[PDB]
Design a protein around this ligand. Structure first.
Ligand SMILES: [Co+2]
Ligand SMILES: [Co+2]
Ligand SMILES: [Fe+3]
Ligand SMILES: [Fe+3]
Lengths: 276, 276
């Protein structure tokens, strides 16, 4: 099999650095009112155009996320603003590749945060692969009518109204062979309730691990590991990072982080080409 | 049957509020360089003068902690400075109660952080009860010559040279009946590797739970729970806080937080009296 892997630029987001690197600049006797920064980071998706079928990793943010009539609560827009041009929208990025939503066989949701699950509702002909604990956690946010937070009620509303077809990865489920050289990695709890990664083995490029928010950046990866402020299971997070490190060394694979500005710049995006 | 419980003022410490309440004030589009604060909080120990023997909960900081020739590293001194008058020193606080180190039968170390295990070395005639995981973790810090962070090399050095007698609480060990109405609570991992609390049943005052850093403050306690930045096991931390809440409700016990300025102000300290 000779697949093509595309990195699609789905805009940028800004947030408190402390979210990304917990306690990045601690206050001191000499700096008692220490300042944080408001850092920019990429929101990207990955399309594996595979002969067995098209696989999508993450879905970025929903077009109608930001704004006065935005699905995102105002507090969320102010803490995690998403800047993107129309071309950065997933549906347009796919269109520029002559890929219709209906052509996606599999969507892998690393987690159900606002900036990874925004456009799940588009893929009504796909099987949405998600960690059961992540699914459960988001569904509770919905049921309890939680309007703030990283789980967008209106996005979840849409998933349900659009009758998405789900395939939950069970807590103790082995990695899933989705297609030749494409494995869903079950990272479990850490950054969120349930994280999924991808291991892709390309004939030419070789091995790629899509870590998503299991590893925000290279600063996160280290060594040493510098965990995020947005974390559900600190222990599981630490374990997941080391697990990823071990797999990378054993499979001689690259590790693609979730939101690393520097790494993203070096990527070949969908406007220039792909990875074989 | 008729004991007296003393609260001993062992000084004040300042640190970044983000340590106490994580992400207490996140940056926004309108406040991108959001400032943290450098808050003050109490360091205290608890003496249970019990007919079966004297029980000490926590040991505060070592007198030789701060300063150019201080045991604490400068970075630590600058991030977590301890201010204390001679009288605030535990040795002095005990002397004013006509209690010699040698008279302590049991020292319960909630955890082995610098602000709780400073003066363990004094109690050479006591049994030091500590969580095995906390003990293990600190001994690793020592063995690896970790000089910075919350585990003071020189402090641990002194514990070993002074030949302290340890009694480790095993990971899955039940609560320990230390004396009539005195009971060691095995909280396990959370704030640190292994946390111990006390439940004291006082004839007059009733039930008291000593939570130490299992719960920093009333703000931590909520509801809802607002976890700290100094955390090892987020899940365990959350579980512990809720376990304490339950025990408190079922035993109609007060919950004494580790570092709550407001609550401490209301405590009757060793200079004014005791709790029966
Ligand atoms: Co996320
Ligand atoms: Co502590
Ligand atoms: Fe993300
Ligand atoms: Fe403390």
């Amino acid at each position: 099999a000779r697949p093509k892997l595309y990195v699609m630029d789905n805009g940028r987001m800004r947030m408190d650095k402390n979210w990304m690197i917990a306690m990045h600049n601690p206050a001191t006797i000499h700096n008692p009112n220490a300042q944080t920064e408001f850092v920019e980071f990429p929101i990207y998706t990955v399309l594996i155009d595979h002969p067995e079928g098209k696989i999508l990793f993450d879905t970025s943010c929903n077009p109608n996320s930001m704004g006065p009539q935005g699905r995102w609560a105002e507090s969320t827009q102010q803490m995690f603003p998403w800047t993107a041009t129309e071309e950065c929208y997933l549906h347009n990025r796919l269109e520029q590749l002559k890929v219709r939503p209906e052509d996606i066989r599999y969507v892998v949701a690393s987690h159900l945060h606002l900036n990874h699950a925004g456009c799940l509702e588009m893929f009504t002909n796909a099987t949405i692969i998600v960690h059961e604990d992540e699914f459960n956690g988001a569904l509770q946010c919905y049921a309890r009518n939680q309007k703030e937070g990283a789980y967008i009620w209106a996005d979840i509303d849409a998933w349900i109204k659009n009758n998405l077809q789900w395939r939950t990865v069970k807590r103790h489920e082995d990695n899933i062979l989705l297609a030749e050289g494409v494995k869903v990695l079950n990272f479990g709890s850490g950054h969120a309730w349930g994280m999924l990664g991808l291991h892709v083995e390309l004939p030419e490029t070789g091995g790629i691990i899509l870590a998503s928010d299991a590893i925000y950046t290279a600063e996160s990866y280290g060594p040493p590991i510098k965990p995020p402020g947005i974390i559900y299971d600190s222990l599981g997070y630490m374990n997941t990072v080391e697990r990823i490190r071990r797999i990378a060394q054993e499979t001689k694979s690259q590790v693609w982080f979730g939101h690393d500005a520097e790494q993203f710049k070096k990527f070949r995006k969908s406007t220039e080409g792909y990875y074989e």
